[PDB]
Symmetry: C2
Subunit: 402 residues, 2 copies
Amino acid sequence: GHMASMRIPEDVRKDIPLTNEVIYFDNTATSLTPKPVVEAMDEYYLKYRANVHRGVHRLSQMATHKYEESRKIVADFIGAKFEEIVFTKNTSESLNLVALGLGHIFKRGDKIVTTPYEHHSDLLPWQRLATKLGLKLEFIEGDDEGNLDLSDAEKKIKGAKLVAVQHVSNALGVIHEVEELGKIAKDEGAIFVVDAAQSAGHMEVNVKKLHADFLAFSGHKGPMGPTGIGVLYIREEFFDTFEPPLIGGGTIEDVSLDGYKLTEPPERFEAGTPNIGGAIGLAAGIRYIERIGLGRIERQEHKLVKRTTEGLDELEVPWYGPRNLKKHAGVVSFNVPGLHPHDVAAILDDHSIMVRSGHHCALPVMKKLGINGTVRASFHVYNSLEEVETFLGVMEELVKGL
Amino acid sequence: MASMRIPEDVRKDIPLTNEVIYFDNTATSLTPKPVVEAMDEYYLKYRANVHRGVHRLSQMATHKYEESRKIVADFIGAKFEEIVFTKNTSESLNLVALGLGHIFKRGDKIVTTPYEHHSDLLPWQRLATKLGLKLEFIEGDDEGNLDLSDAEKKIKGAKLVAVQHVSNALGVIHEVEELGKIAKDEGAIFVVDAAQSAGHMEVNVKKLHADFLAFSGHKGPMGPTGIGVLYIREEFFDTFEPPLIGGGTIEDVSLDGYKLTEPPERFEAGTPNIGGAIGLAAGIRYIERIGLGRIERQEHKLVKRTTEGLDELEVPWYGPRNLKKHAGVVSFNVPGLHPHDVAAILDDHSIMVRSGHHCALPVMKKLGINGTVRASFHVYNSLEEVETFLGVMEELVKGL
């Protein structure tokens, strides 16, 4: 897992056939998958297929070893300990598990604080908890670009029980000052939860630097892994507090008809046969990312955002999110005046340019901006400035087409 | 179905069959190349998120994801909207218990079997503890046979009944049709753990009288890991509270609240295991080409010869002696040898089997044993393999 010499983006594109067929700017929805990751999964399926849990036999020994290796690889990627990594199906499961597993700690009137730009998965579970338990759900103030008011964050966070924030917005591309928010939460004694679904694999994600108590991410996005695998980081300090929401096979020490005994993390939290192929694929993605380097990925994406946003300004096409590109990830949301985003996306698709349109599972963002949705181009290290120029040529013809 | 030799033409698609004698199918099945091919095709050729995005990749992924759900629905006799994707059976079962929790009142009763896998036991125990419910177990014998009279007595007044279709530790095939009729007569919710029956024999929600049913793609259906199914009968759509909510489960949201969408999306939070659903559908299509009939027949042959062969060697084996009630699972013990040791020796001969409690401690405690060695099959296993196995077991037993 060390960086290698390589040409970006050429050397990455070589491993991804779809890059030869379409201009894929829908990375926020899901990334394209490199051949080495598919080969790693295929190897499991065809060469060492077996359940884990240290079955006596050789195949289970090899699957168990690779599963464990994958969990270590994920731990190392985010700066956590092996035992603090739990595998889930996606970020959404991970976040819901936090709310279910911590539900018992709240008293009527306690406070939960989040941002107004959260993806539905990092809003709904907290709304349900607040409604059921009579809690206060408060939102840090921010502007239409996604920039949070840190003075308001300090006020809001004081006396909060739990703070949940996204690292990067999937609709705006704003990169929040998570390290600062985490500091405020820990200085105020609040539990700090981070939705890293749009940051992981696109920039540094480190639990210690973020002051995270819980952190969630999805394999299928930035990390260039498969679908059906997500991660939930649980800081060891919460092992005596967090109630496993899902229990059963693989989570126990002892069981009888009258009760049962739970084992230790991380198995205590992983009920049933895990997504063994998916964890292996994710580890593979992470290794692939490590070879490239998160610094190269960040830098490439910034070049793409810079040219895209500048192009759109030359076309008088309004774009959303921060103007300071230092705080803008590889996501450019925009709109063509007079045209519904779905129509724009359709035109782009006719030109083999894949973008997403709509509310992006972020209705409160759309409502705050007073818009119905946006068109969204989102990048990864394999996207090229040439593709951005094709895109801008198409948007130019669209715009002139009135 | 397609004309093919069993097990030879299935074996041709599973390279591992050339390396080992795989008798740990109840843990997980081996995966045929066409299932891996279907998933690779998704990853390399139409990789995208679903939810009907405008772009062509999303249109194709969405089409294939919907197709996969229909294939699953048809495999178990359900409707499209009643099929919810989960990571595995365990998640499925946990979701039932969490999603129905609100309907219970102190003193209501849940009934299950004493042979349940932990995943079909612990969620009920927890629910019973949290809410102050009665959790009762149907009496039965050491072979796995339930006492249907006692079942009648216990199910009366029950709010919810949960049973496994087939035991992963004993191989017993329960009278699920009969139990479900009883449950429905008594006004109880009927939940079925089909993890061990799916892909090995017919599983039909209408015949079983299921209100909820769970299974795992990685077992009998010859699908990938990380994909499970939770069937929710339409009658419960507005009763079942979705335990996981978020992306993809809504019609509208605002800072002050939300409204959920319709099933099945209402119950599937976040990006689904698209790859895994497509793989599972591929496995179900592969199974269907073989035909469940031919699967069940091939397995009965292997069990018959195995159980006869062990009888010859005076090696005790567990579960029903009546083979019509005995699935493709044979648990046993070699007297004077711990099951892990038997498994290790077998492993030396390239025969893969599992040993231990099989996530069924109550079975082991009921039988007065520490665990068992367990050989389990699928349609790709052969009688020649069983003979090789019996050969190794004979030599072993002979080391008096």
